């Protein structure tokens, strides 16, 4: 019924990172980019109020948000009334960032900033349109096994074909990923045959980009790399894991076409 | 599992009209534009495809489709493979027309289609941005008694304040021509839809309905874009006169 912090549920980052034989010092940095397409409230008369919410979560983060608890929590905004937009701002930034233990940023937009605002694709090449043939759908990180043989290159390459499976009830997520790196040039066919293998994985998003970065790192070893994922959205929210050797964070953050 | 057309769960349109206490004839036309922003197969050599659906269903169609049956019909399309996007596009229009009783139409659109387009708002002016208390959210259709005593006016409003009990949200554009409706009878109308629960497509014909009621225009056009639940958003129109939007770009919510 009412505002309540109670209902976000962090997740420990340190599950998978112990998974991926991660140490305390990562090898990225980076944030996750969420997206809150249905934050609504009343204001101090009653009157609903909308806006799009933009977050940033440190990858430093001890914790992810888990989504379904953030989709709750933002509910519990629907029938309470704030003093103001900046109260909402407020609340916000406090309840992510206990959640999520380390400073999180948040932006809440009215409406009528995304007016004319136009639908983005990623950058560099495509790597989908290869006439191969997948034979079976199990994950597969040795995909990638000497995927990196070509000489030193830097490039962008992307793909819409992202899929995995919430952990639970198998329903699918779907995500385009963009690699930026320099180092070998890697095989296109590996490359997609790799991300298409996650197609019945079961990991948070923000896992399964710690996971490709950290795959692409071990069999490919670029001098750089970053990857970025935009993922569709659950319950009104929508995740953007961002994770680099080098960048902090994504130098745009636009909207794809399924998103 | 794989391609399910019994997934589709059909809902005759009649159920909820029936309260509305219609004429035998429909009072408007139209049709239920619905985005369908998950659409992914496999190909016939196992490699996904992702697209873009829009789907058209008359107003007139014995059915409507419920959306999570909908969202699990589009699903089971996931690990199937079919030959062509055609062949896909056509199992849509076959499976969706049949849910629905009447003819759909359907298009699947590459990605690269929608490069570039715009995020939109609605035409009109914003009704939102009054100074009114509202405390009571209760749904009550006689917040519309007298509200429409204004000159002869052609004009359009819109409010992007709908929200229908887990919660659904939408924006809705109003096009009429009549005496000129009290706007904060209006809003206050829109917003006591707030907790009360009906299908989109029925919130539509209720809001077109009342205001036809209580309002008496000459003319007039209801349209809502709700924002999607479970991949895909439903989007209703209902006119005296026109039969459809212009486009079905998408608002800053979708
Ligand atoms: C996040 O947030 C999600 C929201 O789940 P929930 O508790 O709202 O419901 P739920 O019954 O737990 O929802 C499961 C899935 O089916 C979708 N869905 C539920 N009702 C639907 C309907 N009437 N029409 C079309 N799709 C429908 C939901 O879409 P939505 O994700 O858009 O709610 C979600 O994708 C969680 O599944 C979690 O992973
Ligand atoms: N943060 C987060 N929460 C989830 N809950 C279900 N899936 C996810 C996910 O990918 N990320």
Redesign the interface.
Known sequence: NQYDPSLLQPVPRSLNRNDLHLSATLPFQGCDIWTL??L?W?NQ????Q?A?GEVSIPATSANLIESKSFKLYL?SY??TRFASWDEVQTRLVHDLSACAGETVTVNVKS???????????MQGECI?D??????N?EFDDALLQGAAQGEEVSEVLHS??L?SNALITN??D?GSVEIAYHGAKMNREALLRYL?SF?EHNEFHEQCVERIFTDIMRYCQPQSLTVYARY??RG?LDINPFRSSHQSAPNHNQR????
Not at 111 to 121: D, G, R, S
Request: zero cysteines.
């Open positions: 397409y249905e609504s009343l008369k009653g009157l609903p909308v799009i509910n629907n029938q409406l009528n900033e995304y007016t004319a605002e136009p639908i983005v694709t989908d290869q006439d191969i043939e997948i034979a759908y819409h074909l899929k329903q699918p779907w298409v197609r569709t959205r009104g794809m076409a399924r998103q």
